[PDB]
């Protein structure tokens, strides 16, 4: 599924992400845009054997299990395949754990590079939320 910007903003709001660990809704929409271009099926293989999954590009070295990295961790206690669903719940629930780890949204590289220090509220402007 490729979400529309405003469609995703609404779904993220419904999932309680607005102001979650202090990050306004625009931050979350912007992160999805640059991490996955709003695509719930997005995957990216990394040099360590791990894979980034789904709309928020969550890494299998730490957060989910895909079997392909023996001794890796699964801190969200889910199969990585759950992060490729057309509904965002599993990704959002896992993302909540990630952002609560102690370094905020900096754990998302594309958020740091493309969202942090920008007018993130632009990503939700003009949506009827």
């Amino acid at each position, epitope marked *: 599924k490729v979400f529309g910007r405003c469609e995703l903003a609404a779904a993220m709001k419904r999932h309680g992400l607005d102001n979650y660990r202090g990050y306004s809704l625009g931050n979350w929409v912007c992160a999805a845009k640059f991490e996955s271009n709003f695509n719930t099926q997005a995957t990216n293989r*990394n040099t*360590d054997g791990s894979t980034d999954y789904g709309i928020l590009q969550i890494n299998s070295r730490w957060w989910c299990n895909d079997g392909r990295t023996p001794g890796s961790r699964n801190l969200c206690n889910i199969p990585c395949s759950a992060l490729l669903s057309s509904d965002i719940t599993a990704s959002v629930n896992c993302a909540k754990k990630i952002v609560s*780890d102690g*370094n905020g949204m*900096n754990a998302w590289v594309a958020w740091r590079n493309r969202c942090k220090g920008t007018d993130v509220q632009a990503w939700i402007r003009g949506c009827r939320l």
Partner: nanobody, 125 residues
Framework: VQLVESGGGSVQAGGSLRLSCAAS????????MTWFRQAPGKAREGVAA????????YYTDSVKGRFTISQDKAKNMAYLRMDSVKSEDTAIYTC????????????????????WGQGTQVTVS
């Protein structure tokens, strides 16, 4: 990513020594820069980790209060200042880094790190 260590060598007990690590390539993709050490008879252990995008720091119990990890992010530099050094600090010190986030609970584990410097001997008298 190449990590280039400098500093080290001999130091007296209760004294101070600064180690430096300079990171190759662009500043932006480095996540953690973290000093490890390996002492006579023991495995490599995490000493002090720094998350470069917030400045947050994490120390092993045996150095809390005596060692300080810090950075100059613009230069891809990380520093370890050892104050109040003790015999147990004698070890080979190596800086590691990652280009992907690592949960804080694993930030002092060597298996978390993908890039390493040379090792720099520190000896406490």
């Amino acid at each position: 990513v190449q990590l280039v260590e400098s500093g080290g060598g001999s130091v007296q007990a209760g004294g101070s020594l600064r180690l430096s690590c300079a990171a190759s390539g662009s500043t932006d993709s480095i996540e953690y820069m973290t000093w490890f050490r390996q002492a006579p008879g023991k495995a490599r252990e995490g000493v002090a980790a720094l998350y470069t995008h917030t400045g947050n720091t994490y120390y092993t119990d045996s150095v809390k209060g005596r060692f300080t990890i810090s950075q100059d992010k613009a230069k891809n530099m990380a520093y370890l200042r050892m104050d109040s050094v003790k015999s147990e600090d004698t070890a080979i010190y190596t800086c590691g880094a990652t280009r992907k986030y690592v949960p804080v609970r694993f930030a002092l584990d060597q298996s978390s790190y993908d890039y390493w410097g040379q090792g720099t001997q520190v000896t406490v008298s």
